[PDB]
Amino acid sequence: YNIADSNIANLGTELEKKVKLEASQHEDAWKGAGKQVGVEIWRIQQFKVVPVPKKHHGSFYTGDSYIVLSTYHPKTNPDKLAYDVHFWLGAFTTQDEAGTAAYKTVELDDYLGGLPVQYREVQGYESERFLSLFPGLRILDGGVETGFHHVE
Amino acid sequence: TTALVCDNGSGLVKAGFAGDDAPRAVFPSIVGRPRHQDSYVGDEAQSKRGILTLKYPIEHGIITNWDDMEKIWHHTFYNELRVAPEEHPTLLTEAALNPKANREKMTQIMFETFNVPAMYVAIQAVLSLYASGRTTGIVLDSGDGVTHNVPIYEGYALPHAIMRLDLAGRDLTDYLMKILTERGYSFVTTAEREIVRDIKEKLCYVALDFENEMATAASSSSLEKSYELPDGQVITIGNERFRCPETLFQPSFIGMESAGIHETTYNSIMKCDIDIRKDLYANNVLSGGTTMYPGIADRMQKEITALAPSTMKIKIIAPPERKYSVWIGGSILASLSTFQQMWISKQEYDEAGPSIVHRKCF
Ligand SMILES: Nc1ncnc2c1ncn2[C@@H]1O[C@H](COP(=O)(O)OP(=O)(O)NP(=O)(O)O)[C@@H](O)[C@H]1O
Ligand SMILES: [Ca+2]
Ligand SMILES: [Ca+2]
Ligand SMILES: [Mg+2]
């Protein structure tokens, strides 16, 4: 099996990038994101990307999944912005929440031109980078209900 | 408006509704016709298996009988899910490296025959990776027709490193049929093959050390299992339990010269840029029914450890519901309005024809 004349011949193209960039324009959560240095946080709630109020940033429900965008000035230019995007997966989050957080992390990456570096942060396995965002990580019991309907 | 998600496997249809945690319809991808030389689909063909010869419209993940595939899809919509397809956007799936005409004809039939309002064709292994809650990893997807390796980084498959083998569950069933008949148990008809597939699913496993397990099986009966046939006769199977899926690691068992699944996985990682191999080695995600053998994750961990640098963290992820991971990933993505935004509409198909599938579905 070769790539030519196959369903993967258009992967990795400018066309793929254009299509996914356009799709990311249809998510209200990203409007105005990544415009200044700091940390922005959303939680997945029944497949939706819901902003977390600033006053609660750093507290995470163990039952839920989150997207954390860290905007910073890179070493290369003090007046430009660079990005780490962390998705945090609670020990008790459900499969719909973790999968939506993963897909929407890629989408936010697309929205910001591919510039964000992605980090998968499972509860209890958080990277030093993630820990460093809260110089104050607090884990809460509970979380919002799954968006899945359970097939009996 | 609820989207339909249909994962058309070579062996099993998995179909249902976006937003559900599992497919509501799972049934053999078969059309049956009288064994004495007009047709039945799926479970009703399986029900009349005594008088029917069973044909699979998909071989090695590619639709080879379009008339019968239309019967499968019609059955899925009207007889199993009991929906009107013109009322439902529909997500279909494909193995990577299929010829482009396969999804072109999928698109044509969905719009022109079933009049769906919108549709998308997704890469199966990408769906499985999202179902596992990851954007980076290497999926080993192994079903009834195709085994393939798809490395993915930050949500994008690496097409130059994708590997594919025509060795999968159907070949393992056939090999079990062959080696059981060599024990004295005749299984030959497409009907008896069904019994053998059930034996394979119930009793086979991957040995951690194949040579040692062969010696154990020849010394005592400690590895033997009984199996009751439909007529009530009880047969005993022994080293066939683990010789059958050993073929995945030693394709020469069925006369193939190709690499085993540990080697194709390693080779795929090795086709990726050096610095991301680390993340792939730590995120080998198993998907599909043929990855369900007890012992397969431990065996992959052992074999990949032997091939990889000694300092490399290796991890095999084996989700318990991985018979349905592809479908579940489809259910999640089809629940997202931004993913739906990329689907082909009927109006777009009317303007552009089948070629539009390559411009919209990635
Ligand atoms: N517990 C099990 N152990 C081993 N094999 C199994 C088990 N359960 C199912 N299988 C095999 O898995 C295959 C079906 O898996 P499935 O993932 O639904 O394939 P598919 O999607 O229909 N085919 P493909 O077109 O290759 O993706 C058949 O060969 C089954 O016999
Ligand atoms: Ca939750
Ligand atoms: Ca990026
Ligand atoms: Mg499959």
Residue numbers in the entry:
A (entry chain B): 7 to 141, 144 to 160
B (entry chain A): 5 to 41, 51 to 375
Sentences reproduced from the published study:
Actin is one of the most abundant proteins in eukaryotic cells and plays essential roles in various cellular activities, including locomotion, division, and transcription control. The dynamic assembly of actin is controlled by the hydrolysis of ATP, bound to the center of the molecule. Upon polymerization, actin undergoes a conformational change from the monomeric G-form to the fibrous F-form, which is associated with the flipping of the side chain of His161 toward ATP. Here, we report the crystal structures of the three mutant actins bound to AMPPNP or ADP-Pi determined at a resolution of 1.35–1.55 Å, which are stabilized in the F-form conformation with the aid of the fragmin F1 domain.
In P109A, the absence of the bulky proline ring allowed His161 to be positioned near the Pro-rich loop, with a minor influence on ATPase activity. In P109A AMPPNP, polar interactions in the active site were essentially similar to those in sWT_AMPPNP, and His161 was flipped (χ1 = 67° cf. χ1 = 61° for sWT AMPPNP). In contrast, the χ2 angle of His161 in P109A AMPPNP was −72°. In addition to the Nδ1–W2 bond, Nε2 of His161 was hydrogen-bonded with a water molecule (W* in Figure 6B) that replaced the proline ring. The less favorable His161 ring conformation is likely stabilized by the Nε2–W* bond as W* is in a position off the ideal ring plane. The ∼20° less rotation of the His161 imidazole ring resulted in subtle shifts in the two key water molecules. W1 is slightly further away from the PG of AMPPNP, from 3.2 Å in sWT_AMPPNP to 3.6 Å. In addition, the distance between W1 and W2 is slightly longer, from 2.4 Å to 2.7 Å, likely explaining the increment of the W1 occupancy from 0.68 to 0.89. The optimization shifted the distances of O3G–W2 and W1–W2 from 3.7 Å to 4.1 Å and from 2.4 Å to 2.7 Å, respectively. These geometries in the hydrolysis-ready structure were comparable to those of P109A_AMPPNP, suggesting that the proton transfer process through W1–W2-O3G properly proceeds in P109A. In summary, although the efficiency cannot be determined, P109A is expected to have ATP hydrolysis activity, which is supported by the P109A_ADP-Pi structure in the following section.
